[PDB]
């Protein structure tokens, strides 16, 4: 696995506590704690960490590269942070806050409210651009998906909550 | 939340605020007394037992349930109460709002609650498939000899048997039935009567277990 072996990781002003299996990364923006694969072992030199597979078996390899990028995501995220941008297109389609929760007005004859969680923060911009931010890449991904599932883009006028810079295949149905 | 043991007296009618005829049943709840307070660590589930009516006290040589037997006198004297005739218990209630020995009074119910009345049906005795099971009966003419009996009880060689649950003649009645989402129109505290909109199960002079709707 190139991802796993070849690409060595780079702890940058963070504290990667490899406590046996359960690792514990902390830095500017907070602490993330995961249990990585058992059979794998880790070699932390100065300002660098390296993952090693036990064998050359498919299992050991598919797992190897998987939780070598799951460390990088933690260290790269507890230091620089992970953010997702969602745009809202459409006459009357808005985006507004309410005590760290997000009310959405997307033409649903009812206001939709996404409540926020730990280590996660929402923000709007010109009432159209929502922004989810946090340290886990899989929370920023989970929430941003939840907020696009409210009204995903449609194929005729593109109206809906689209990821910033996401190709919306536009059909041209006519009257 | 609330529960009272009563008995059914009959049905009448009341007129409502806008003139509507309200069909009602008169239920008589009097001297409902708590006799125990079941608890989770003592019995495994928290609830309270209410005794209704009033039997006479023990007498030697009693020949009827009119008088209490020695076993029941003791159970009721531990709650300083008189021997009672009907004993049931309630789980929906908060066991800590009741005390062993209190009277449950008709006024527990205010006008416009939602209650469930659980009684026993009236006995119809041994009946047949058309009254007991609502079955369409056969032709009464055109040379028929199949007037009221139930039809086929099965198939043929496949399942050379009658399946369980085949709706056949027998006793009708004597079943606990719970009508749901009834309401009380008035509670009278002096004659001790809770009036309930609609109709309830049972013969006249029966027993109904009114408590608060679970829905």
């Amino acid at each position: 696995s190139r991802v796993g072996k070849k690409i060595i990781d780079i702890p940058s002003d963070v504290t990667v506590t490899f406590d046996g299996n359960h690792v514990t990364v902390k830095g500017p923006k907070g602490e993330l704690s995961r249990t990585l694969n058992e059979r794998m072992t880790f070699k932390q030199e100065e300002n660098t960490i390296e993952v090693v597979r036990p064998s050359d078996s498919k299992e050991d390899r598919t797992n190897h590269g998987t939780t070598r990028a799951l460390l990088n995501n933690m260290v790269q995220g507890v230091s620089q942070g992970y953010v997702k941008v969602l745009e809202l297109v459409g006459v009357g389609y808005r985006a507004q806050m309410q005590g760290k929760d997000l009310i959405l007005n997307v033409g649903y004859s009812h206001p939709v409210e996404i409540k926020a969680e730990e280590n996660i923060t929402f923000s709007v911009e010109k009432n159209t651009v929502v922004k989810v931010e946090g340290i886990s890449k899989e929370q920023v991904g989970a929430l941003a998906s939840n907020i696009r599932s409210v009204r995903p883009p449609e194929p005729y006028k593109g109206k809906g909550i689209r990821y910033q810079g996401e190709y919306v295949r536009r059909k041209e149905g006519k009257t | 939340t609330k529960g009272i043991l009563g008995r059914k007296i009959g049905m009448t009618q009341v007129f409502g605020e806008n003139g509507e005829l309200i069909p009602v049943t008169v239920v008589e709840a009097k001297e409902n007394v708590v006799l125990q307070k079941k608890t989770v660590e003592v019995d495994g589930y928290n609830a309270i037992q209410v005794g209704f009516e009033d039997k006479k006290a023990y007498k030697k040589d009693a020949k009827s349930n009119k008088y209490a037997n020695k076993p029941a006198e003791g159970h009721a004297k531990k709650a300083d109460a008189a021997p009672k005739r009907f004993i049931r218990e309630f789980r929906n209630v908060d066991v800590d709002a009741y005390e062993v020995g209190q009277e449950v009074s008709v006024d527990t119910f205010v006008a416009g609650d939602v209650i469930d009345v659980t009684g026993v049906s009236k006995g119809k005795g041994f009946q047949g498939a058309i009254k007991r099971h609502g079955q369409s009966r056969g032709p009464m003419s055109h040379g028929s000899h199949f007037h009221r009996a139930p039809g086929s009880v099965g198939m043929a060689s496949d399942a050379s048997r009658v399946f369980k649950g085949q709706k056949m003649p027998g006793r009708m009645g004597g079943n606990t039935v719970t009508v749901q989402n009834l309401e009380v129109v008035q509670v009278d505290t002096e004659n001790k009567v809770i009036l309930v909109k609609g109709n309830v199960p049972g013969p006249k002079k029966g027993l109904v277990e009114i408590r608060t709707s679970i829905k």
Binding site: - | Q13, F15, G19, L21
Partner: protein
């Protein structure tokens, strides 16, 4: 209680002097109807002339019945004959008058032109 194969009088000047019913609209398996309910029916006696002629299939509304109706206060209104009125698929009559009394319950069904063109609302 009006079911199919029931003959009703027409209380209007549509042409139809008397009609019988086929179905009671309002539901699968619906069997009966009372005041304020619509039925499909085919006239059996027409006036010479008139807009509706004999043997036609028509929508119609029940205006009075012998079974009659309970009202919310325990008051009952009964009548001495079944009766009906033809409609133009807009809750409006086909004829220009309306003969005989009508029950107040037709007000609710928005058969207002039937209630307005009536000798007695009851």
């Amino acid at each position: 209680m009006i079911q199919q194969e029931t003959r009703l009088k027409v209380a209007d000047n549509s042409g139809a002097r008397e009609v019988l019913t086929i179905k009671v609209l309002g539901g699968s398996g619906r069997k009966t109807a009372n005041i304020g309910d619509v039925i499909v029916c085919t006239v059996k006696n027409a006036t010479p002339g008139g807009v509706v002629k004999k043997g036609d299939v028509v929508k119609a509304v029940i205006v009075r019945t012998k079974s009659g109706v309970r009202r919310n206060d325990g008051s009952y209104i009964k009548f001495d004959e079944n009766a009906c009125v033809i409609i133009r698929d807009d809750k409006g009559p086909r004829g220009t008058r309306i003969f005989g009394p009508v029950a107040r319950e037709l007000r609710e069904g928005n058969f207002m032109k039937i209630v307005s063109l009536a000798p007695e609302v009851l």
